[PDB]
Structures are given as structure tokens and as C-alpha cells.
């Protein structure tokens, strides 16, 4: 039907009934429905009053010659009878997420882990037409049939954050393809593919660079804070940066060792851990400075890299 | 030399076996190179060393050791293979050749001069399951794309 | 609730009731409220009459394709029934003041005396969402958790 498009396994339908909604770029069908029973429509109020809407012809766009609004059969009057409201086609949000969450759009991902990706989007035109997905190689060729995994190229409205094929969204297995930057193209099934109804989501495939760490300075004195950055990691997962207690000053205390790593940047928790238990900065309950053996700071990543910091104060001169 | 043949529009697949091609194009295919770099020259028994090399056309590679007989497989560990990047280069972390478990490592334990070589996934259990689990002979190792280099083991030091 | 946001220790709420206010960039929740009981809304008067407002989708911005005004369920008519007015989000004034008054924004301050600073602002969207504060070093890194002292990063309207 119309308004429930996937209920009949149809990618589109153009049989408009009275009171439904119509979008800018549609091409109404003149068969049974409100396309032969009432082909001439006139505006009701606002900027659309008096203006006519010819359903037997394709509807113009960019809000010119067809103002948005409710349309009567009589125009601005005392009749509320076969009826059309004219909206605009829109794609609001769209993301590429891994099998366990984590947006990876516009960011390089490892070829090994790029095997259970998902594509999701939110679009305004759900009653009229579904939105297609078309993966394009950097050379510019349709590779969709090679990488498609399920959902039949049609992604439903909503379903953002759906990590399973049960919900709306299409899975692509981009593991077999070589390294490069790829573009995912979303557009309407038949007609709604112009501006603001289509979006190109890019994706970079490259060899898995192992975790990379860099420092803004290598030769520093005590007391000078140093910022460390973690590079080339999977988004949404928690790394652990460790600190050997042998490098710590011998005259340090329990509370003196839990502040080597700062809460600066994306750091989540700081403290000192042992093979059995851990002593975080929240309380001095776990191992003591002599009891513990490692100082750590669990850090997440947002994008391609995350930044933390250290306090070179109370560190051995070595 | 490899050729591609096109056929006129509207022709069926079965009926196109005999009719001549409207046009054609030919390309040449050659075999790539798979060599090792770091496990060469000298090796202290019991020490750990990385696996360094290149592989132009490869997906999975295996390391074999030979001494007066069969090429005994060396059990590197996970999946017995190393992936290759886009730069046609494959690498592995520091691995103790003699330390690892397997009969392949046992040959290298004793002091002497031996041979070590790498081979692509063309073996694939010399026909069968998709896993490198055999001890390929001289003919089997040489038939596929591979390369070997002389290695000798030196006793420990301090 | 909505309109009294800190009363439930919530930083936001998207359960719009009839007659409330809605801002440009909101993302209405289709759960219980005026997001499943009445998802289709139409304008009432002015430049907004006839124009539709789709609550099931994010609301556009910059006063284009969604004119500001009161929205009916019937449009310009004789019904005053489930209802939304569309305003614009705004921050009017904001200052940094020392423990005993005195604006210090955009001006160098001594490190010794910069230990009891305050951040205040006035914003239009108090019924919908609180406003966050994020201190950034000149290198461009979030140092908020290091310098935070209280109030839980949320600053109220007025004040």
C-alpha cells in the first residue's frame, strides 16, 4: 500500500489516496486512485493558495512553482475533500557502524575488521519510496552486488544504531576489496534522488596500522606534563596505557602513584592495578604502591585518534 | 597469454561456443616473487627473531625447514599463515624458532647449517582443507611459488 | 518533566505535551506523548500556515522549510487542539566572573587568582536541553574533568 511500503515487498508505490502526503520530485500514477478520479488540484492557504497542482505531470522542485502546503479540490474555501499535502524529501542522519557499534564513516578501517559493516540512514520519504545503497570503488564502478550481504539493498526509516541484520540497514562485507577510499551512495528508489534527498558517505580501506603512539616532546624535565596520543585504533573500544612502577621514584606513596596519568583528553579511569585487583583514583582500597606493580589509564577513542597526558613529575631520571 | 572474446548482441551463452568473436584483447600473466629477508645468515639457538620478507601475489604464507630430507612444517602459531599488505610485504613479530612447539623446530635445535623457505597458500594441504598442514617434499615445495635461503645456527653466548 | 528539566536530574527531555514549545534543531521522541498520538502537524497563521511539521523526523533549521509560529492539528481553522509553537534557540549573554564578581572574560588573569572562577550564561532553551561547558586548552584538548569544581557541568538559565 502507501504509507506501509514494505508490507507488500514493494520498493515504491504511486497510488495516492485522499489526505496522504506527496513529495517534490514524485511522478504520480494516473491509474486507479487519486490520479484519474481527481487529476486537478488547487492550493488552500499560505503561499500555496490559488496555485494549481497537476497530478498527471511530474511535480516540480526547489519550492518554486509548487508551494508547500495542503491542497483542496476547490481551493481556499469551505470544502475539505480529496486532498494532498506537499512536503520536501529529506535525509537527516546516516552512519556506518561496526557489528558492535561504533561509527566508522569518513575514517580508515582495517581490512580484516571491515567484514561486518552496516549502513543506516534516516529519511523523510518512507511512505513513498525506499532509499537505495550503491557502493562505489575509487575507480568509480558499482561493486554493490559483490559486497552486499543482506536486507536486499533497502534500508528502512529509523533503525540508526541497529547492529544486526534483523533491523533496518544493509550489511556490506568490504574485507575482500583492496585498500582505498570508497563512497557509499544513498538515493531514492525511483524519483527522490536530487539534492537533500541523496547523501554520499565515504569510507577508507587500508592496511591495519598497529597502534601508534607519539609524544609532543621526547626530552623533558620533571614537572613538565607530556601529552601522548594513541593512533590507528578501532573506534569505540577501550585501550590501556601502562606505566611500569620501576620507573617511579622510590619515595612515592600510594596516592602519589595514582596521579601519573591525568584525566585530560579521552581518559576514562586512572589508577594502579595488580594481577589480582586494581586501585583506581576513586578510592585507596586496592593494592598499595608497594603492593601494586603497574600504573594504568584506560582510554577510549573517538574518531581516528585519542589524546591523553602524563605527569613527568616524580619520575626517575632515566 | 590470456585472451578475452566478445560476441554480438542477442547471442545466447550456449550458442556462442562455436561462433567467432567479433573482437578480442590479450594480456600476459606471470608468477610473482616470495622471499625472506631476516631469517638469513646467522641464528643463535633459542633466540627470537622476526619474519621479514615480501610476497607479490600471496594471501597466506608458510615457513618450512629442510635438512637432508622432507620440508618439515614450522608451527608459527595462529593459523600458520601471515597476511600481506598492499605494499606486497608481510611481516611477523619476534618468534623463537626453536622455542615454538612442533617437529619442524626440532631440526633447528641442533647446531649446523640448514635451509629455510617460505611458500604461498598454493599448497592448501596439497589439495583438501583450507589449511597448511603437511610436510611438503622437494617436488611439492618447488612446484609452487617459493624461495629458500641458507641458514646456520650458532650455539648460545654471554 | 518538560519545562522543569532539573526537577528530575535530567539533562534533557523530548516528551512534548500539547501547547508546549519546540526549537529548531530538536529531535522529537516518538514514544508516549505528542510524538505517537499526533505525529503530523500543520501550520496555523502567518508564514507558517499550510506548512507541515513532521515530528517523527528531525526539525530543520535557519528558518527555512519550517516557519516559526503556532501549529494546529487542522491548520488554519476553527480548532485549537494538540499544539506546538516553534521558537529559535539562543544564547544571549555569558560571562566569566571571579569569586567576588568582576568579569574576566577575554582578559589575562593571574594564575594565583584564577582558582575560583565561574561560568554563567543565559540561553533561550531551558525547557528542552541544558547547556554544556567544555574547557579547551590552547593545544585543543578537553581538560574539563581536570578543572571542574561543581554544579556538574550544567549551568542554569539566568544566574
Numbering used by the authors:
A (entry chain F): 35 to 352
B (entry chain E): 353 to 510
C (entry chain A): 35 to 193
Quote what the paper states about this structure:
We next investigated how the in vitro reconstituted csg sheets were related to the native S-layer on membranes. To this end, we purified vesicles from H. volcanii cultures that have been previously observed (Shalev et al., 2017) and visualized them with cryo-ET. The relative arrangements of the domains in our STA map were nearly identical to those seen in the in vitro sheets. A notable difference in the S-layer structure on membranes to the in vitro specimen was opposite lattice curvature, suggesting that the membrane might play an important role in affecting lattice curvature.
The entire outer surface of many bacterial and archaeal cells is covered by a two-dimensional array of proteinaceous molecules, a supramolecular structure known as the surface (S-)layer. The H. volcanii S-layer is essential for cell survival and plays vital roles in cell shape maintenance, mating, and many aspects of the cell cycle (Abdul-Halim et al., 2020; Shalev et al., 2017; Tamir and Eichler, 2017). This S-layer consists of repeating units of a single 827-residue SLP called cell-surface glycoprotein (csg), which is highly enriched in negatively charged amino acid residues, highlighting the adaptation of H. volcanii to hypersaline environments. Using electron cryomicroscopy of two-dimensional sheets, we report the atomic structure of the S-layer from the archaeal model organism Haloferax volcanii. This S-layer consists of a hexagonal array of tightly interacting immunoglobulin-like domains, which are also found in SLPs across several classes of archaea.
